[PDB]
Structure 1
């Protein structure tokens, strides 16, 4: 016979705006790291960094010419951050003939490979081949005027190819 204070909760959807909603979570901000971002209405991957854009007060999203997300406003802070796609590229194996040697050099194309001897070039960066100041004819083309060859007790060298 003890009195019980009861509450009855009813929920329904009337093909109407979701006036009532529940929160999921929130995390601390991370910059200069390839992360999977979640925001008010977009999800994806990319590298977030401090920007210098001029978003309007009512605007929250950024789009480039090709209609790809560029910058996103922070929901909890009046700060706007550019989104740079996480680095990617092709992996090219530079080798002489297998009958010559088994030493190979690897070219990570179009990446600043401080993120991946090591030689940085305009076609990516060449790992496994040493850079020399001499100039020869092009044996194995790499790009941007750089060629590689199996010369000098032997290794793979990277030089600027000589026109003649």
Structure 2
């Protein structure tokens, strides 16, 4: 079996005559090591979409980057429910939504990006 992912100890109780399992639709969840007979789950490493926030082309060449639904623990830094947004400056006061992001947060003012 040749694939990629993260191997973790499996609490999912196998039976003496099971080598690996699938939770749904051919998605193999675990496997028993052919040496130590231990069952480890394969949870694929995080991935997803990346989007760019810009004020345009003439207004500025600066840009903020949003990593959709990713906890910023992998590669300023501010976390939302849309995902982790890096490059924008967070502010407290509220305004009219200019550039929509998601989950009620929108984004340029005073020569920089604001969230």
TM-score (normalizing by structure 1):
0.64
Q: What's the C-alpha RMSD, in Å, of the aligned pairs?
A: 1.5
What is the CA-CA distance between 1:156 and the residue it aligns to? 0.8
Structure 2: distance between partners of 1:84 and 1:47: 5
Distance 1:50 1:134, change over 3 A: farther
Tell me by how many angstroms 1:114 deviates: 0.7
**What is the deviation of 1:50?**
2.3
CA distance in 2, matches of 1:119, 1:54: 40
Q: Deviations over 1:114-137 (max 9, x none)?
A: 112011122121010022222212
- Residues 4-55 of structure 1 show CA distances to partners (whole Å, capped at 9, x for unaligned) of xxxxxxxxxxxxxxxxxxxxxxxxxxxxxxxxxxxxxx11111112231111
The match for 2:39 among 67, 71, 80 is 80
CA distance in 1: counterparts of 2:76 and 2:103, whole angstroms: 20
Residue 101 of structure 1 corresponds to 60
Unaligned runs of 5+ in 2: none
Bigger mean CA deviation after superposition, 118-127 or 75-84 = 75-84
Looking at CA atoms only, which structure, 1 or 2, has the larger radius of gyration?
A: 1
Matched, 1:90 2:49: yes
- Separation in structure 1 between the aligned mates of residue 23 and residue 71 of structure 2, nearest angstrom: 23
* Offset of residue 153 of structure 1: 5.0
Inter-partner Cα distance in structure 2 for 1:66 and 1:113: 30
User: Secondary structure at the residue paired with 2:114?
Assistant: strand
**One of 78, 92, 100 as aligned partner of 1:133:** 92
Structure with larger RCO (C-alpha < 8 A, sep 6+): 2
Greater strand percent: which structure?
1
Structure 1, unmatched stretches of 5+, are 1-41, 159-164
So what's the TM-score if we normalise by structure 2?
0.88
In 1: Cα distance, 2:76 partner to 2:84 partner? 11
Moved over 2 A (4+): none
CA distance in 2, matches of 1:51, 1:137: 49
